Design a binder for this molecule. Structure first.
Ligand SMILES: CC(C)c1cccc(C(C)C)c1NC(=O)NCC1(c2ccc(N(C)C)cc2)CCCC1
Ligand SMILES: CC(C)c1cccc(C(C)C)c1NC(=O)NCC1(c2ccc(N(C)C)cc2)CCCC1
Ligand SMILES: CC(C)c1cccc(C(C)C)c1NC(=O)NCC1(c2ccc(N(C)C)cc2)CCCC1
Ligand SMILES: CC(C)c1cccc(C(C)C)c1NC(=O)NCC1(c2ccc(N(C)C)cc2)CCCC1
Ligand SMILES: CC(C)CCC[C@@H](C)[C@H]1CC[C@H]2[C@@H]3CC=C4C[C@@H](O)CC[C@]4(C)[C@H]3CC[C@]12C
Ligand SMILES: CC(C)CCC[C@@H](C)[C@H]1CC[C@H]2[C@@H]3CC=C4C[C@@H](O)CC[C@]4(C)[C@H]3CC[C@]12C
Ligand SMILES: CC(C)CCC[C@@H](C)[C@H]1CC[C@H]2[C@@H]3CC=C4C[C@@H](O)CC[C@]4(C)[C@H]3CC[C@]12C
Ligand SMILES: CC(C)CCC[C@@H](C)[C@H]1CC[C@H]2[C@@H]3CC=C4C[C@@H](O)CC[C@]4(C)[C@H]3CC[C@]12C
Ligand SMILES: CC(C)CCC[C@@H](C)[C@H]1CC[C@H]2[C@@H]3CC=C4C[C@@H](O)CC[C@]4(C)[C@H]3CC[C@]12C
Ligand SMILES: CC(C)CCC[C@@H](C)[C@H]1CC[C@H]2[C@@H]3CC=C4C[C@@H](O)CC[C@]4(C)[C@H]3CC[C@]12C
Ligand SMILES: CC(C)CCC[C@@H](C)[C@H]1CC[C@H]2[C@@H]3CC=C4C[C@@H](O)CC[C@]4(C)[C@H]3CC[C@]12C
Ligand SMILES: CC(C)CCC[C@@H](C)[C@H]1CC[C@H]2[C@@H]3CC=C4C[C@@H](O)CC[C@]4(C)[C@H]3CC[C@]12C
Ligand SMILES: CCCCCCCC/C=C\CCCCCCCC(=O)O
Ligand SMILES: CCCCCCCC/C=C\CCCCCCCC(=O)O
Ligand SMILES: CCCCCCCC/C=C\CCCCCCCC(=O)O
Ligand SMILES: CCCCCCCC/C=C\CCCCCCCC(=O)O
Lengths: 375, 375, 375, 375
């Protein structure tokens, strides 16, 4: 079974009309308004824009080095498949493409001493492009093996908010530019909220790790003190980059099928949590690793087939982190596995939320430790 | 217009069945589970039961001095009205009743050096009894002025969750003891949550006010650091003593009409906020001060009639606080007035939530300052 | 034969209407009025409230340590039987319940140096709860043994004036609050009468036991001098705690079947005296020891079966006394046995009344001796 | 209206069959049995027969000097009226009769130093004989005044339990000698009970009045200590000499109309108390002073007519007391008047019983004081 596309609307959006959720939304904006008034009134007697100006250090060079990678992932796979579907040298071309964005974004990352944010831009873009380039390839190839995909659909697909290539993509009548303006305003608001959290309740508690004799009193209490930044960081990532950002693009491109996330907050079974969190990357990983592993192995036993998807999911995130902050030690590999093992096999809903709270409380602390032990 | 009673169910209860709210409920229990695991794991290498054992110092003497006050407010008003409705000395008896719980709970509060919690018990009980005793009198008196209320209904009314005396009180078929057991379990859970907040994120930041040279750096930043304890304290008071506790008693006594609070979190207009927060005391204050002021004055201009209710509401809360922690300075009088003036006259919803957040952030800080400057 | 309940009225109550008994009742109130006028006129040139304030020393702590015992005996037996009737761990829970009010009321009695009155409160409450908790268990268990009792009926039963659990309890139309007010007024009057007796005709004769060379002149004459306090103490216990108090609760709870005592004062045979004095505890002891001993033993000879009930009745009262005044020596064990042996086997009515008069004359004297030899 | 005689039975006798009163009766016999066992067991290591042997000092001379007085009151009035009803010297004879028992029982009382008991015998006999001799005279005389009573009826009347002379006296079929034997057994039992009270709870507390500095501490407390002997003395006088003794004679003489006392213990109004206590002397006093005062004065105003009966009643009792113990000071004149004034003019039932209790408590104390201040 390969995914078939329908015209359902993003669950939170149709839910965002129910009044009590507009209240919760307003309560969180009040929370932002409290941080901005208090930080203003304190630092007046300027702001924590220290992070934004620092973190976005070489953002010009980041975007100027994004451009050629985008041009390469645009041209290379299409030309490769087009000549290859005329019966050549494509085998070398797509491999050269696989290299041009496997070395370039690492070279430009390390050799030019990039800050974290403008590093995370390029690393996300390289995984993104690898995923959807390969997706298009594995879709188009079986069509060629009889004893030409439309270019416009490909270029469209490269900006479409989904990683599955269908060259159908059932669309909406028109574009509510008021709605996309609101969505990007909220996305920027979310970035400012995350900036305030990392500037105020994350750094000041963790700046002073130079005064640590390997005691467990400034690690456990610090982890608990940092669990709330942790949960806000994760939940803001969710809202900003899965309901603000992807819905904004799903609007601009007239893209239907806006189910990027089903109710993950309701997930009783942990399988349901994997199923209904970030459904776009889940759909790619499911279609192109699980349902291809099952075919390649021909395995009745998914036991080895799955834990393949989990292993790829585990290395991808550690690669990203290890890349973004230049840290050789994986924590979220070991934490990913130990949380996997706990929630997978070992009102149940509470345990997931608890093991998610510390699931963040650990991530932030153990990183802000070595982000300063390296500085 | 005097209030008429109907068999509607408490809004949050019928809302508590909708699944996303069961999620939020579970998220908050996860929060509690994180505090208990972390406090256990820290203080093992015992608990903050320091507060519970301290705050409930003479709780025995508190309940044993509650008993006679309850016996007096039970007997005195009924006997007085009963002989007074036989044509006597009642005028002296009700005045003696008005004294016996105006002096006794102050005497036993000050002259025995009571802690805060077992002080707040008696002060709530004395205001409670004054309010509903007077309520019964002003209901039954006009019935007597023709040129006898059933006693069982009075003793019932004295325990009924509403402050209006109707001696009808439309009732429910039977008693779901599973539901009341759940409600009291949640109420105790709420007290443990509040204990953890006051023991962990309120006291440790505020213990060190002995090292203050009248700087505004350890007042403003401390107020913002204490805004979140503030909001949790208020919102736990709401859930514990308006949906856990009063619904539990509204169940045990087969009492219908469980509308103690309409959607206050939705209140756009501030008048609506006063209308739909703690509807029981609002209903008493409305019926017996506003609609009686309007009658006494005969005033077309409510301008003096209202600001009477607000003034009584303002002195009552300051009396409680000033009593409970033995503090002569009113803050929430001046704060009550300055917040009144701001939200009353000066998407709007956000401003209320913001001016509520600091509305708490101020109360806690300015008190935990003088609770230690006196100790 | 297990007891079946009927709607008969308490014999003394229906007798209290016959005019000559209203005379005797008035004669005894005259007696009280003589003590109050004379004590007032003497001690003016204040009262014997010395005993009431002393005896009720830590009455606050007594009621606050009563509360958890009541909560435990409410919850534990029901929850245990309920899960045990779902096919568990109940066997441990009821044993933990059997401990929580076997140690707690002894600990709080001895380790806090309680006075006699506020000791007798808790010791009565622990025996009371043990008796009716066990009663409920042994009633409900045989219902479960087929190859759920209503909770409301259990909590009701826990306050019902009878120790047999029936969950039927045939009830009266309504509640004569005038009658219950009268009953509690009489009960308080009885306590004041008993206070006056112990303060005037018991202590002043017995304070001077420091001047005793083991002579029989200040023991026998003192015993006779103290026989009348003795009879008034017993007969006031009868009227206060079997016709004032239990009828007041049998009224408040709409409980029918108010036969707590048949005409004991008429008892010719001593078996009839055991049968018709304090019929509630007699009914429990009969149903759950005699009629269960007969079943367990399968004994045609009740000779060992009875003297079981008598032995339990003998140890229970000595346990109470030994507990209440902290006296290791049993007298009313030996006196209970010697009076048993005399009236059981060895116009006849007179001998019982005589052997009751000294039956009291002994108890008081032999106690007020060692209550001061220990002080 | 002069009294007319009917065949009603003594109220307590027909009441003595109702079972609860047989219980009270047995309770009082138990009380006697306790005094006899305890006095025996004490004085063994003989009895208080000291009083009986002392008080009945010259009882032989008392009876031998009773005889001639009886012979005189028998013969003199009959012979006087018989000759006087033959048309003489009768006017001198009845006057000589009035002297022969007005001087003789005083002479033999004082000049021979008689003890109290054997004095009270003769003083009762002289008032008794005066009353019924005069009664017969005032009955028979109006029959003679037309322009002979049967002797046997007179001699009978002189022993009849009533003071009104009717020479009809409606009689009963026969004589239940079992019943009269029981009555005299009870009468002797009552004398033994009174002896025990005066020997044990009256004298030992009052022997030590030689050690009094005119303090009010050994007068008020002693009066209260002696109120219970007081009430038993009065109530035993009632039972012994109005239900044991007069009913025994009302049996032996086949006399109907045994209403010597209606329910005095029920008397709400004090007029009812005078009406229904000792109805025999009341009937004489009513018939021969009140209904003759009203005739002599012809007074519409009974105000002076009554207070005549009260004055005669007041002097008669003080004469008796003053005679019996040789005490010149009247207390029960002043107490009679002060109790008269209080209960006559100034659930009401209680006050009478209270003012009776002290009404005795005073009498005994104030006498046992001067019975020893004279000895
Ligand atoms: C949030 C994470 C623990 C998680 C839980 C369950 C399932 C998944 C995948 C297989 C869909 C993920 N990982 C993810 O979605 N990674 C991609 C993104 C991501 C989210 C959070 C994090 N952090 C934990 C910082 C990193 C990447 C989504 C939004 C931005 C990219
Ligand atoms: C919460 C408060 C600012 C407020 C806002 C709007 C309207 C009212 C009244 C007129 C109903 C109140 N005050 C109140 O309800 N006082 C009584 C109680 C109360 C609530 C909070 C506080 N604190 C602010 C600690 C004190 C009392 C309700 C729950 C317990 C008693
Ligand atoms: C009064 C006692 C000697 C007695 C005689 C005959 C039968 C019984 C029982 C088996 C019903 C008792 N004991 C009793 O009833 N104990 C319980 C109570 C009791 C009564 C008197 C005493 N005292 C002798 C002080 C102690 C307990 C009843 C009222 C208060 C509790
Ligand atoms: C008992 C007395 C206070 C009293 C109250 C009310 C009415 C009367 C009369 C008018 C019938 C009397 N007095 C009386 O009855 N005197 C005669 C007797 C009497 C009774 C008691 C006393 N004492 C007070 C010792 C003296 C005489 C009756 C039984 C023996 C003679
Ligand atoms: C606009 C700026 C201030 C960011 C606002 C973020 C808020 C409005 C968004 C981001 C994540 C969202 C939450 C994530 C999921 C849940 C759990 C659900 O059971 C209740 C709604 C709730 C709690 C959502 C409410 C709206 C939400 C809180
Ligand atoms: C709070 C501080 C650290 C600001 C954080 C800035 C970074 C972490 C945030 C802000 C804007 C975000 C980016 C905006 C949108 C995109 C395009 C998408 O195709 C890849 C992810 C990427 C590149 C996001 C990654 C995370 C991001 C770069
Ligand atoms: C049981 C213990 C842990 C206390 C739990 C308190 C939680 C479950 C209760 C107390 C107060 C309640 C909240 C108060 C009002 C709102 C605003 C509304 O727009 C969304 C629901 C929400 C957010 C409620 C959800 C449930 C709630 C959070
Ligand atoms: C967190 C720490 C300080 C514990 C706080 C304990 C106090 C503040 C809480 C816990 C239980 C609460 C009480 C329980 C219920 C009642 C009965 C009601 O008729 C008056 C209010 C009153 C008396 C509550 C007042 C507030 C209260 C006393
Ligand atoms: C109200 C205060 C003063 C206490 C009064 C106690 C009196 C009124 C009560 C308590 C015990 C009762 C007594 C106990 C039993 C008997 C024996 C019976 O054969 C006659 C009634 C009699 C004598 C009762 C009469 C009423 C009584 C005496
Ligand atoms: C005369 C002086 C000593 C006063 C005596 C006070 C004591 C002995 C009396 C007064 C009130 C009585 C208590 C009131 C009612 C109850 C509740 C019942 O479920 C158990 C017995 C118990 C607890 C009684 C026991 C005896 C008691 C405690
Ligand atoms: C035979 C010896 C022991 C003397 C016995 C005296 C007793 C049995 C007699 C003498 C006086 C009598 C009492 C006097 C009047 C009353 C008041 C009445 O409302 C109840 C009966 C009662 C209480 C009588 C009961 C029997 C009585 C007590
Ligand atoms: C307790 C001690 C003092 C014994 C008292 C003995 C005296 C007071 C008692 C015992 C027997 C009684 C007497 C027996 C019967 C009679 C005959 C009657 O026609 C006159 C009264 C009279 C004479 C009684 C008067 C009181 C009396 C004399
Ligand atoms: C597993 C690692 C996470 C990789 C993140 C993938 C994000 C989802 C992928 C594609 C949808 C994004 C489409 C809209 C972004 C266009 C912005 C741009 O090109 O600058
Ligand atoms: C304005 C000051 C706030 C006063 C608080 C009043 C609370 C609401 C009043 C009555 C409803 C309470 C009924 C249930 C409580 C019974 C508990 C008890 O009696 O101990
Ligand atoms: C044998 C030892 C005597 C034990 C005494 C037992 C008393 C009779 C038992 C139960 C009936 C009492 C019911 C009314 C009391 C409720 C008062 C309360 O709970 O405080
Ligand atoms: C007012 C002073 C009291 C006087 C007492 C009078 C007693 C009642 C009078 C007469 C009835 C007595 C009849 C039986 C007694 C005969 C005994 C005898 O003669 O020895």
């Amino acid at each position: 079974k390969q995914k078939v596309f329908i015209i359902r609307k993003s669950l939170l959006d149709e839910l965002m009309e129910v009044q009590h959720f507009r209240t919760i939304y307003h309560m969180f904006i009040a929370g932002l308004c409290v941080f901005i008034i208090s930080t203003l009134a304190i630092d007046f007697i300027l702001l924590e824009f220290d992070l934004l100006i620092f973190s976005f250090g070489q953002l010009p060079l980041a975007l100027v080095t994004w451009v050629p990678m985008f041009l390469s992932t645009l041209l290379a796979p299409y030309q490769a498949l087009r000549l290859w579907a005329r019966g050549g040298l494509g085998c070398a071309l797509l491999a050269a493409h696989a290299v041009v964005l496997c070395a370039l974004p690492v070279h430009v990352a390390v050799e030019h001493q990039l800050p974290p944010a403008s590093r995370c831009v390029l690393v996300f873009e390289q995984v993104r492009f690898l995923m959807k380039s390969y997706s298009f390839l594995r879709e188009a190839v079986p069509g060629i093996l009889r004893a030409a995909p439309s270019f416009s659909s490909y270029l469209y697909f490269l900006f479409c908010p989904t990683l599955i290539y269908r060259e159908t993509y059932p669309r909406t009548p028109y574009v509510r530019w008021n709605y996309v303006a609101k969505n990007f305003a909220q996305a920027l608001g979310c970035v400012l909220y995350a900036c305030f959290i990392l500037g105020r309740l994350c750094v000041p508690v963790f700046a002073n790790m130079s005064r640590e004799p390997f005691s467990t009193r400034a690690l456990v209490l610090s982890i608990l003190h940092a669990t709330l930044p942790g949960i806000f960081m994760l939940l803001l990532i969710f809202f900003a980059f899965l309901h603000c950002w992807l819905n904004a693009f799903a609007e601009m491109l007239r893209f239907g099928d806006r189910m990027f996330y089903r109710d993950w907050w309701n997930s009783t079974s942990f399988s349901n949590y994997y199923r209904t969190w970030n459904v776009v990357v889940h759909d790619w990983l499911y279609s192109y690793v699980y349902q291809d592993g099952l075919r390649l192995l021909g395995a009745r036993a998914r036991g080895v087939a799955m834990l393949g998807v989990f292993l790829v999911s585990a290395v991808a995130h550690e690669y990203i982190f290890c890349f973004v902050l230049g840290f050789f030690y994986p924590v979220m590999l070991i934490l990913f596995l130990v949380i996997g093992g706990m929630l997978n096999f070992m009102a149940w809903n509470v345990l997931m939320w608890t093991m998610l709270f510390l699931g963040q409380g650990i991530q932030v602390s153990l990183y802000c430790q070595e982000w300063y032990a390296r500085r």
